[PDB]
RNA sequence: CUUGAGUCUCGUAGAGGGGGGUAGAAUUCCAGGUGUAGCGGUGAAAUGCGUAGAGAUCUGGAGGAAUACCGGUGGCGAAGGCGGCCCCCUGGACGAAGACUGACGCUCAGGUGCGAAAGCGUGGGGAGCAAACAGGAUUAGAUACCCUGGUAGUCCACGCCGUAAACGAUGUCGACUUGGAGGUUGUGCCCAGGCGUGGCUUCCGGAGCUAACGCGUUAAGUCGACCGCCUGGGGAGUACGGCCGCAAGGUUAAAACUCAAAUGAAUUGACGGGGG
């Protein structure tokens with residue numbers, strides 16, 4: 001299934017991001033999962049205050065992965081209290097071409 | 102202590118008008134209603150009764166020495182435009198006028214329609 | 218309609234420049250009567266804006 | 282300051298109001314009994330009752346018929362009320378009795 | 384619905400050819416698969432009345448096809464009901 | 472609606488700008504319609520009424536050659 | 537046997553259904569800061585709230601319910617109905633080209649299921665709203681309409697109930713019979729534009745039909761198959777009996793008696809606290 005994950009990180013813990021990117025991409029590729037795109041737009045200004053913050057660290061990942069690993073990736077995002085917000089969508093095809101960030 | 106820059110909150114209901122002047126942080130200085138300014142009953146819900154309440158509020162904040170104001174109007178009532186014009190005449194420079202009327206995006210069920 | 222002319226297959230929640238042409242100053246979705254958007258694309262455009270608002274890429278209201 | 286408070290404590294006494302009931306010379310038993318229950322209620326709440334009786338056309342010829350209604354009402358509310366202005370003549374095309382509590 | 388692969392299997396197992404999608408045995412087989420699959424769905428989701436209506440038309444279409452086969456050729460009928468494990 | 476007063480602009484023009492901005496947003500029309508509860512059958516009836524009008528105008532316009 | 541009915545392949549649109557998560561806005565409440573005499577309500581008032589500091593304004597928290605804008609005689613569903621966003625499970629429809637089965641069909645008394653809101657049972661929950669109820673008014677009276685409050689209920693789980701102007705007041709399936717203007721969703725061809733071809737849907741109108749009003753290829757027209765139902769008004773969808781339900785009640789369903797009408801559409805007046 002072609003998914004598409006976005007997640008935002010607390011701007012203080014902006015240096016845990018390359019670690020987290022590795023930890024997650026590992027679990028995808030460690031169950032016959034591709035990574036058709038990964039981007040890191042970095043810190044940008046929030047359009048409204050999320051729990052008192054005014055900025056956060058954005059990470060896009062397009063993926064092709066088996067059902068259950070995406071469920072496990074969601075349980076991670078929950079309990080990791082550095083992740084302020086996340087969004088797992090489905091897609092029809094794989095997306096490789098670059099976003100406008 | 103002198104302030105110079107504050108905020109003018111206008112609560113313009115159908116039945117009354119309240120006008121509070123606050124600082125930058127929303128700490129109050131002095132207030133004036135259109136019910137406390139003589140007018141009673143349905144007299145207090147006129148455009149004129151609001152003008153008076155604005156003018157009476159201007160003179161409660163003489164001792165704080167305010168020059169600049171921002172105007173936070175809230176409601177559908179008659180004393181919307183006239184309250185602002187009154188604060189202009191009282192000598193305050195008006196930096197910014199903002200509507201802050203609450204709308205629920207749905208929310209709670211309102212009361213039944215009046216059969217009259 | 219733009220999206221017919223350009224041959225857009227899906228409108229993106231990340232193309233914030235394009236989405237900003239279809240919200241108000243207050244930050245409400247503009248009707249298709251006004252813009253001239255075809256009805257299929259109005260439905261996509263609306264989904265996109267609501268996804269953008271969740272990720273705080275667009276505002277819900279102008280008075281946040 | 283306030284004293285409004287004290288006014289509210291003074292207000293929880295009473296104000297007497299006058300409740301008007303209107304009979305006619307020919308008024309049937311059931312409809313009489315309804316109007317009596319109105320009067321009982323008013324008097325037990327401590328209010329005055331202006332019982333009227335009207336005449337039309339040639340009902341004025343038989344004034345005695347109307348008088349007995351007012352007498353019947355009076356005797357039914359004897360224990361509850363006192364009479365204050367039992368009528369003498371037809372003033373206009375009306376007679377007016379006024380009762381009062383206890 | 385049944386997958387493209389799961390379909391293609393049953394067309395081979397029951398068909399007389401693998402273009403033979405039409406035959407009564409294939410049709411009955413395809414329906415039996417999806418009926419059995421949905422027994423799991425309605426175990427959890429007991430108040431999905433709208434989907435259950437789709438199920439009951441599968442059951443109805445199968446019963447009709449079987450009754451056609453019983454009178455067209457009783458030999459092929461008795462084979463099919465044992466393979467698929469149908470009582471009647 | 473947020474209207475910053477611009478440099479060397481008089482109060483009257485800024486007050487007019489505030490009105491149009493509120494008109495465009497439709498702030499008061501929202502407050503009016505949310506004052507009392509309108510049950511769904513009523514809202515559907517009103518929707519159908521204005522639809523017939525909108526159509527009837529377009530006809531009578533074009534039906535007048 | 538392949539033309540009705542099905543199956544397969546590729547795609548398309550959708551508030552179709554079930555489960556779980558989550559977002560922003562708002563109302564109320566709680567706890568603080570600033571501030572001080574009013575607030576609230578009406579046709580007019582009063583009840584109510586506030587110096588034990590309200591209302592207003594600011595910050596932080598708590599909880600429940602519903603998803604502004606998009607939004608549309610737009611869409612989906614057998615009907616009832618279905619509207620934030622995301623995932624999981626799942627039903628139907630439609631189009632293009634073929635391939636396959638070979639009348640496998642249509643309708644349905646009994647039967648079985650689904651079925652708005654209120655209501656019932658057992659547990660939860662409870663912001664807002666609100667039958668009953670309490671107080672304030674209005675009035676000849678006012679067991680109302682208006683005002684301040686307010687319990688069941690409205691929400692959730694599981695079970696029951698089986699009714700609505702549950703309406704298009706129009707049963708299901710199939711064939712045939714001039715046109716015009718739109719919406720929505722596929723698709724072919726030529727060169728965005730042009731020229732075709734399907735599905736669904738809104739408005740006008742021809743023949744014909746109709747008591748008239750109107751209906752008019754989505755028929756109330758022309759025909760064929762099967763089912764349901766009607767036989768003057770009241771008495772009465774009531775009584776009795778049966779079945780069903782915890783109950784409320786539902787369902788099936790008469791007769792005596794009484795009247796010469798009751799009724800539908802349209803016409804001319806008059807009238808309206810309807811409009812110009």
Ligand SMILES: N=C(N)CCCCNCCCNC(=O)CNC(=O)C[C@@H](O)[C@@H](N)CCC[C@@H](NC(=O)[C@H](CN)NC(=O)[C@@H](O)CNC(=O)C[C@H](N)c1ccc(O)cc1)C(=O)O
Nearest residue numbers: 216217578579580581673674675676677678680681682809
């Ligand atoms: N012409 C009139 N007398 C008065 C005209 C109305 C009053 N004028 C406005 C006064 C100021 N405004 C208000 O006060 C706000 N309104 C209220 O609060 C009153 C309401 O309560 C309202 N419902 C009163 C009845 C109106 C109307 N009545 C009817 O239409 C109904 C039937 N629909 N009843 C009848 O017609 C008769 O059966 C009995 N009429 C009667 O005996 C009359 C009754 N006793 C009465 C009511 C109010 C009043 O001030 C004086 C007398 C009416 O014409 O009176």
Ligand SMILES: [K+]
Nearest residue numbers: 078081083084
């Ligand atoms: K989190």
Ligand SMILES: [K+]
Nearest residue numbers: 662686687688
């Ligand atoms: K309560």
Ligand SMILES: [K+]
Nearest residue numbers: 748749802803
């Ligand atoms: K005629």
Ligand SMILES: [K+]
Nearest residue numbers: 776777778787
């Ligand atoms: K019975």
Ligand SMILES: [K+]
Nearest residue numbers: 768769770794
């Ligand atoms: K008879």
Ligand SMILES: [K+]
Nearest residue numbers: 807808810811
């Ligand atoms: K007239």
Ligand SMILES: [Mg+2]
Nearest residue numbers: 612613614736
């Ligand atoms: Mg449909």
Ligand SMILES: [Mg+2]
Nearest residue numbers: 384626627628
């Ligand atoms: Mg599906």
Ligand SMILES: [Mg+2]
Nearest residue numbers: 653654655690
């Ligand atoms: Mg209910």
Ligand SMILES: [Mg+2]
Nearest residue numbers: 655656657689
């Ligand atoms: Mg209950």
Ligand SMILES: [Mg+2]
Nearest residue numbers: 212665666685
């Ligand atoms: Mg209430």
Ligand SMILES: [Mg+2]
Nearest residue numbers: 212213666683
């Ligand atoms: Mg009430």
Ligand SMILES: [Mg+2]
Nearest residue numbers: 699700702773
């Ligand atoms: Mg019925």
Ligand SMILES: [Mg+2]
Nearest residue numbers: 616652702703
């Ligand atoms: Mg309905």
Ligand SMILES: [Mg+2]
Nearest residue numbers: 515701703704
């Ligand atoms: Mg209807």
